[PDB]
Design a protein around this nucleic acid. Structure first.
Lengths: 75, 107, 79, 226, 95, 96, 95, 107, 82, 97, 226
DNA sequence: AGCGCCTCCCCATGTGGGACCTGGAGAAACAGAGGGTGGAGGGAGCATAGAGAGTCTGTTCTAAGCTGCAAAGCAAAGGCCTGGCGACCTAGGAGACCATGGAGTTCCAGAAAGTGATAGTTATGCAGAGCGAATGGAGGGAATCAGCA
DNA sequence: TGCTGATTCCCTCCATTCGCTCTGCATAACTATCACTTTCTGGAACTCCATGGTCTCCTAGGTCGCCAGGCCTTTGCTTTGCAGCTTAGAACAGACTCTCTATGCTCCCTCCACCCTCTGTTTCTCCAGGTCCCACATGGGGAGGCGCT
């Protein structure tokens, strides 16, 4: 259950950083393809940011945005 | 032995023999069980007597001696069971019931 | 041959007064003429079919009664 | 199944009007007329009138015309009875009874009756009161003043109870009535026969004609056993 | 000509039995004949279907009683069943 | 002069034509209509007088019943005037 | 040892494989088809029986079935059904 | 002595012999001519072919390859004639035609 | 001995039957009226089916009796026999 | 949070239940209602499963068709809410009353 | 009896839209689909689409989707066609044709044809044109690409006139067509046979399939007498 | 602005005058009744198994209850437009009458066509096996609604 | 006018079960064949009745004009039904038992069809009055514009 709270807090600060940076969720989905060759849609980013997808799907989509946060921090 | 009829045996006015002949030749079954025309004739006589009694009562309230099809229509439509039996039935020269909806009246 | 105008305005007015209608719009009459034409065609087609099956050239009251009946509109008083 | 619910007793001041409900259940309400019968210990049972809920058709007795008003409400399946200008001779028990629109049918199921207290053709019943043993034969005559086409019914009433329909169409047995009772006769002469007696048969027996427009009850026989 | 039968004398006998002052017109007699023929066709067709459903090749008074219970409404069916049972009992009890 | 307000003579006509039983369409235009309608199915065919009379009785009864349902539709639409939409609704619910 | 039921489920499937070679059918749809064929059979046969009874005839021929199809079925449906019946009767009375 | 059943002689798939037997045992007439089952089997086969082909087309525009009663209801209710024939007929597990009145749509 | 089972035809079931009928808005008094209408229809069809069953000298109501009852009341049902 | 306007979910329910085919009433309450109604005609009766099933399809089809007629009566009165007067008018015109 | 009224010739500048009516009389309008085809000198007859007034159900050709829209007015018994963005290759004769909802039925009755002037199963007909005397026999072949289960029709068209239906269901005669014309064949091979000719047989003959979803007409055979 | 006494038109009742329709009597004739035969259809017992109650259980999906609110329903005013009512002049319907010729019907022959009985062979129903079409699950994307700008 | 965010519904994939389709066996019913009968074409006269045309007289309809009242639109209030959420309860699916009743088999036996005579019931035809509709007079009642209050 602690992993769910950690995912919720992490999604919270990626939403805060994305609002701070001005990038849209579709911008994140488009830049995922640039970062990994894995382009995701608006709906996938919305589902992840709302924290109601599957746990396996959550863990699968997690490391891509872990790298995306570091990419958007400076690059 | 004087050849008394089946309607007088059953105490009816409607013909048992003619109803038996119409049931036999009317292509309803292979056999007719010979108590079936008695039952049929009794049911037809009862329905005729009920309709004719209500129509004669309507003619008497209409101060008429003779029954016209208006009296038959007034007898049939004023009874719930008779109107249910003859819902899809048009009576010629019978007219309709006097019925004006309550909104259409003045004041 | 026209003859649908022979079902005049006061005839439809009388048929509506028997039905209990107090006020009648002006466009009722043409709709009623079309409705009566459709009903008459549906009954008369079956009556003519019953007549043609009997090898007859005359439409009798029995054919009309059978035609009416087949539509669930049984008519009493004509045999 | 079939029941006719009626209200409690009424203590009414004279000159006012009183409403009477006849809430019905267990049957199709519109297909049966509701008749109203008044019962006094001095005139016996008197037929007042009937309402037909199918067309709201009224018919009243001539002596109750204007004094009584019948109404129907099909939403709540209720029959209302209005009495206006209450004369001191209105302290009576009022029953509402079901009766089909068929001419052969009679007042089969009755209500309990409301006791209101203010603060043609004549049936002749030959025995006014008779005594019978536990296994005797009882014969009651209901000689009619005019001719009726076998449209006579026989009713049994216990003290402080609603009447129970025994015989309809002068020979046919009612629903649930045992075959000990037997009606006979036609035209102007009618008879009711009790075959073997029980302790239940201590009751008052009436005969009602419904062959003509004013319905008339009989005088009634009091039958008590041991 | 060709002797076509009807129910006019039978309906007139019934009418003079239930109303021995009241006459009838020709048109009302035509209505009554149409009524008797229509109800005959309905009851006989329902009894024919009832015999066909139960793999029976005869129409008895039980089929007619069940058909009368089917077509006719409640008290109408009850009184018609009483009349038919009374007539069949009288016919059996008297040859 | 004297003049009845609208709806009075209409209610009088309703009472008069509901009290009587005679046919409301003239016989000759209905006979001509029946003959022309039957011309499309048969080229040269005759008609019994009873046949046209039965057709007239059935058509007038059908029209009176449809006008009853039309009046019910008009009253349900909070009106006292019947419109063609009431006829169309009544024939739609009836299945025609 | 129980007796066997009979239906149209074999012929309806043959007609289906004529009109649609690569198309199956469920058992419920076959039940609908069996009820449809039975209903239309009773309608046409009863109509033709009434036609023979009105004309005082004692036999049902293909003329009665043709007139019953004309009365029962609506326009183009009745036209094509009359076409099919006429072609089948012409083909049957040639061998 | 041989082959050649009456359906194959008429070029049909519906059984002429079974339809003749059902016409004889159905209590419709005293006699049955031997052109009436042929006409009757042809009419039944045509109606079955029309309904089955329309239902197969409805199944084909559903990325399906099996007719369910929904496809039969879609075939029957989408036709003026067919609906008229089977207008007073309930099809089990067929549903209704998908339609919404135009005044219910938002604008 | 069952009693008060018309309430088992719940308000969401009547709402679903209205949605299949194309109804957008439903008043609150619709449900009791629908229960009464469904009850009356059920007693008519069941009464005819029980009459068809009692003629066959059976204690079991079959689907074929229901089909004959529906055919009798002009509501022919396909797919359950016949 | 997020909420849908009234009539939006009610239109998607129309679009959902008109494309589906199965029964809309629960099976066991309808079976209990059928047995309750039939016990007033003959005691100790025993239906088949297909008899109750056929009764359910018949009743649901009748109720759905009456709801289309009720909706037409409601739209004729310039409304979108069906009312008991619409049911009464539809049953009156249909001949059920 | 059955008439399909249409409008006159419409001269139209490119860019705008054009409307064509198909006012129908003599039959029940809702029971028959109205189908629209177009005719050009370049490619002959081709089917555009249809509209069923019973449920207002449309079906268009794949090459005419967006180019042509179809609407119906049930009160006036009319069917309207919209063509939008008329390019240079749109000057054509546009026909509306009644056709029943039955699969066997074909375009039995046609409209007069509106001339619009702007400022898949392959049908193989082996004879493009042929000459005949006043009494010999003519055979026209309509071998098709795919399998059609006898859903072929034969039409005769006079110059500057609407096509006339001759053969439906690949063998059946149309209404009023004499027995000189005879259709034959099934599957993929079909043929039309003229037994003995007249002076009125100088016309263009077409074969149309309606077994598949896009209906395709024939290439057309010109028949000239003497 | 509010009822009410005159005016007026319409309906309901009474009293003859006949004209039409119903009621009643006589003669064919045909169909219902009587009686004797013979073959069933349909009853009574008797048994077995399919089947329909009846109960337990675990679940999870659906119903029930509450809340905020928005939009649909209902009432009230106002206007205009469209039917109702009355007058009048005329065309067409209603009723009666005659001619007629084309049609519906009864009469008799007989010839094609349907029925009835038998054998048996072929078509069809019922039971069993095996793939395929069809559900469910899981994502994934396109479409659409709703609130902020 | 957006548009960005959030739900929701349609597209694919992949095992996974359930059911449809094919095959084999028995048995019942369909057909070929012959003898018999009997229904109905097919002329044919023969009456009859529906059409067509004439004629006259009313009277119902078509047209027009005037007005009121009813229907439609707008605006405002309110109220109630909807969308959504939380909790629990009962429907459902499976898994048994347990009787019970529906169905088939056999015996036989009552009764219904069939046929031949016969007579008496019913239907067709024709008179005779009684029921009733029309014409006219009288009176009550309901509707509706004007006076005094």
């Amino acid at each position: 259950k602690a992993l769910q709270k950690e995912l919720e807090q992490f999604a919270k600060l990626l939403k805060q950083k994305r609002i701070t940076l001005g990038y849209t969720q579709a911008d994140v989905g488009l830049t995922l393809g640039v970062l990994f060759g894995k382009v995701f849609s608006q709906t996938t980013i919305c589902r992840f940011e709302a924290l109601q997808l599957s746990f396996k799907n959550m863990c699968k989509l997690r490391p891509l945005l872990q790298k995306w946060v570091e990419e958007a921090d400076n690059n | 032995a004087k050849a008394k009829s089946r309607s007088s045996r059953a105490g009816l006015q409607f013909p048992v023999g003619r109803v038996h002949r119409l049931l036999r030749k009317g292509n309803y079954a292979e056999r007719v069980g010979a108590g079936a025309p008695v039952y049929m004739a009794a049911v037809l006589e009862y329905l005729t007597a009920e309709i004719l009694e209500l129509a004669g009562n309507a003619a008497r309230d209409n101060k008429k001696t003779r029954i016209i099809p208006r009296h038959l229509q007034l007898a049939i439509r004023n009874d719930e069971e008779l109107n249910k039996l003859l819902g899809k039935v048009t009576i010629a020269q019978g007219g309709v019931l006097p019925n004006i909806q309550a909104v259409l009246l003045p004041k | 041959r026209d003859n649908i105008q022979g079902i005049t305005k006061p005839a439809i007015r009388r048929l509506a007064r028997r039905g209990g209608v107090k006020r009648i719009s002006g466009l009722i009459y043409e709709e009623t003429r079309g409705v009566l034409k459709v009903f008459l065609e549906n009954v008369i087609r079956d009556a003519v079919t019953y007549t043609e099956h009997a090898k007859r050239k005359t439409v009798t009251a029995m054919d009309v009664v059978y035609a009416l009946k087949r539509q669930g509109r049984t008519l009493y008083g004509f045999g | 199944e079939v029941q006719l619910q009626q209200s409690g007793p009424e203590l009414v001041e004279p000159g006012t009007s009183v409403k009477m409900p006849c809430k019905a259940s267990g049957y199709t309400f519109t297909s049966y007329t509701i008749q109203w019968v008044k019962q006094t210990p001095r005139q016996g049972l008197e037929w007042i009138g009937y309402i037909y809920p199918y067309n709201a058709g009224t018919k009243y007795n001539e002596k109750f015309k204007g004094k009584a008003t019948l109404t129907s409400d099909k939403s709540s399946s209720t029959v209302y009875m209005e009495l206006s200008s209450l004369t001191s001779e209105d302290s009576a028990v009022y029953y509402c009874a079901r009766k089909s629109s068929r001419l052969r049918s009679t007042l089969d199921y009755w209500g309990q009756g409301t006791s209101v207290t203010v603060s043609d053709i004549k049936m002749t019943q030959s025995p006014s009161s008779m005594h019978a043993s536990l296994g005797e034969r009882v014969t009651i005559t209901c000689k009619a003043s005019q001719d009726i086409r076998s449209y006579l019914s026989w009713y049994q009433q216990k003290p402080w109870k609603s009447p129970k329909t025994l015989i309809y169409y002068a020979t046919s047995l009612a629903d649930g009535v045992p075959s000990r009772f037997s009606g006979s006769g036609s035209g102007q002469d009618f008879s009711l026969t009790i075959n073997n007696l029980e302790s239940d048969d201590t009751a008052t027996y009436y005969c009602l004609q419904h062959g003509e427009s004013p319905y008339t009850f009989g005088s009634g026989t009091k039958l008590e056993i041991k | 000509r060709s002797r076509k039968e009807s129910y006019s004398i039978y309906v007139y006998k019934v009418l003079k039995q239930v109303h021995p002052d009241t006459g009838i017109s020709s048109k009302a007699m035509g209505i009554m004949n149409s009524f008797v023929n229509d109800i005959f066709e309905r009851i006989a067709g329902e009894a024919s279907r009832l015999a066909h459903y139960n793999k029976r090749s005869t129409i008895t008074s039980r089929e007619i009683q069940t058909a009368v219970r089917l077509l006719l409404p409640g008290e109408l069916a009850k009184h018609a069943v009483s009349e038919g049972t009374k007539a069949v009992t009288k016919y059996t009890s008297s040859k | 002069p004297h003049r009845y307000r609208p709806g009075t003579v209409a209610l009088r006509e309703i009472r008069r034509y509901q009290k009587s039983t005679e046919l409301l369409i003239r016989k000759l235009p209905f006979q001509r209509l029946v003959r022309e309608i039957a011309q499309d199915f048969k080229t040269d065919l005759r008609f019994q007088s009873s046949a046209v009379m039965a057709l007239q009785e059935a058509c007038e009864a059908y029209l009176v019943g449809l006008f009853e349902d039309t009046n019910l539709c008009a009253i349900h639409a909070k009106r006292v005037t019947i419109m063609p939409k009431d006829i169309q609704l009544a024939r739609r619910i009836r299945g025609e």
